[PDB]
Amino acid sequence: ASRILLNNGAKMPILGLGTWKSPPGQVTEAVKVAIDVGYRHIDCAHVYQNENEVGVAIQEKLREQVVKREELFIVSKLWCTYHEKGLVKGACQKTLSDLKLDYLDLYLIHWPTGFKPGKEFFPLDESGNVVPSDTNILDTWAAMEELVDEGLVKAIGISNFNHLQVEMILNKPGLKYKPAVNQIECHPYLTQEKLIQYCQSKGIVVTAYSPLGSPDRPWAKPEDPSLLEDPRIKAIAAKHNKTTAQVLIRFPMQRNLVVIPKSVTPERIAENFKVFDFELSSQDMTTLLSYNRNWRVCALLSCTSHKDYPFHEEF
């Protein structure tokens, strides 16, 4: 099926469009095309500095009568510098105002780490470490719950939380809403079997980010593994007469994950959506799972001393 049931009774489309690194000067067209060829889920964030331009595209297609708002599944994320309980509503309203929406379908805590409030997205000391804030996951969660109760967001969840951090929330005395989603990095070089088993057994839907291995990531090194150019995965694709990207998008779909590949290239946006006409076999799945090397595109290496840094735990 094309949509997966959330704990709030709403259905979330399992294929979404990512917008990290989609330049403001190109993402409006990207979103318009995406909606034209079938995407109903758009993954956004304040820190991507393009929510205005995403909102432009959504408004144009609403006005064109291409789609209705209730058909769209729009996700955004609370950035690290806004974890203080008193800042959360404002950050959410700023996203809403940029997106020109009166609600989000899903709002995530982008990272478990809070950063010093301020204009700078990554405030650093003088030795490259992040300046943290005096915030904690549970208080931030309570502030996220308020957003649901106020009608600004239909569901809330988390991203880049390890299983102990998810458990902190789950076990919170006085919890009002469980997280609906945990959005994590996931692809054949980081297959996340243990965190995925954890989340799914707790009724939390997992969204896989960087499913193509984020070749456009800003700290890419030449020696780094490149999923899209992996000859082994290329062989799996050729056998299905699909491209490597299509294989990499279908793979999480067959693990009951949501997946959100990013493109601003109209041809690729369309191609990437054509992954409902084929099935990966059991061998394919097994083979791709076997490529795990616990390799992260997004390791937030500037925050490794932060008290809530998520990736010291095995999972």
Ligand SMILES: NC(=O)c1ccc[n+]([C@@H]2O[C@H](COP(=O)([O-])OP(=O)(O)OC[C@H]3O[C@@H](n4cnc5c(N)ncnc54)[C@H](OP(=O)(O)O)[C@@H]3O)[C@@H](O)[C@H]2O)c1
């Ligand atoms: N929660 C968080 O911490 C977090 C972190 C990272 C990412 N995410 C979300 O997940 C999304 C996906 O992750 P990502 O942006 O890191 O990377 P990705 O989707 O793995 O890869 C994007 C790169 O792949 C290229 N691409 C797309 N389709 C292609 C195709 N068919 N053939 C060849 N190249 C193709 C894109 O190029 P063009 O765009 O130039 O076509 C872009 O350079 C993000 O945009 C964001 O929405 C969330």
Ligand SMILES: O=C(O)COC(=O)c1cc2ccccc2c2c1S(=O)(=O)N(CC(=O)O)C2=O
């Ligand atoms: O701090 C580091 O060690 C490396 O720099 C970053 O990770 C970084 C910088 C960033 C600097 C300015 C805007 C966004 C930045 C992002 C990121 S990110 O990869 O966490 N990430 C993806 C996401 O959070 O969805 C970002 O949107």
